[PDB]
């Protein structure tokens, strides 16, 4: 029934809001708080390692929130441990990149980072100009689409609940959940006259994979660097 679909939509939105670190209202409010040129130079002078240490700690923190998101989804806990993990491995980082568009401000090309917004220059110490620049462009594109909270919640749900991931044991159960999500999302897109938006999405697979690699590089080589 139509009412049943709506229960699913509200439920997915509930769980997404519950597992966002800051409420979207708060992110928008704090757009005004902007790093001064001196604070920017503060970050720019840090060592490569220190900057990646901080960045990876935040990448990690976001992934954990994405895991919480999955826990609160309708059929996800019912899946076997193997499946829960397979889906999170394949999709968690991509979810993190989508959730990031919320914290990006398109007006001034700046991003929430550790209490205040600042530009791309804030991350010079990381050294990976091509990668950082791409993460900015990706977020810029998503912002241009003006995804609402509901659209992000449902789309990120579908990023996780994908039935074609190699390694899944209970493929059918996962199809059941994915199909119900595509049903609810399709209905929501129809009522809001937003059917075409998913065509406009920029590709996120290569980018998320690079972020995962950087996160892993830091865990592997921690003994070579200072205690944290």
């Amino acid at each position: 029934s139509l009412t049943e679909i709506e229960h699913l939509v509200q439920s997915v939105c509930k769980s997404y809001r519950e597992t966002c670190q800051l409420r979207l209202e708060d992110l928008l409010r704090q757009r005004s708080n902007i790093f001064s040129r001196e604070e920017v130079t503060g970050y720019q002078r840090k060592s490569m390692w220190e900057m990646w240490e901080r960045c990876a700690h935040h990448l990690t923190e976001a992934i954990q929130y994405v895991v919480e998101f999955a826990k609160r989804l309708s059929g996800f806990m019912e899946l076997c441990q193997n499946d829960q993990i397979v889906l999170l491995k394949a999709g968690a980082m991509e979810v993190v990149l989508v959730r990031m568009c919320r914290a990006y401000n398109a007006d001034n090309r700046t991003v929430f980072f550790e209490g205040k917004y600042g530009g791309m220059e804030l991350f010079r110490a990381l050294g990976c100009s091509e990668l950082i620049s791409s993460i900015f462009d990706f977020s810029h594109s998503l912002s241009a689409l003006h995804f609402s909270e509901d659209e992000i919640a449902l789309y990120t749900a579908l990023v996780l609940i994908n039935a074609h991931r190699p390694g899944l044991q209970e493929k059918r159960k996962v199809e059941q959940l994915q199909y119900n999500l595509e049903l609810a999302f399709h209905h929501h897109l129809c009522k809001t006259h937003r059917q075409s938006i998913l065509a406009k999405l920029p590709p996120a697979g290569k980018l998320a994979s690079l972020c995962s690699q950087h996160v892993e590089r830091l865990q592997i080589f921690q003994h070579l660097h200072p205690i944290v």
Partner: peptide, 13 residues
């Protein structure tokens, strides 16, 4: 990625 997996396992349990 195995690094990602470690974070996820811990978070789940």
């Amino acid at each position: 990625n195995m690094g990602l997996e470690a974070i996820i396992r811990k978070a789940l349990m």
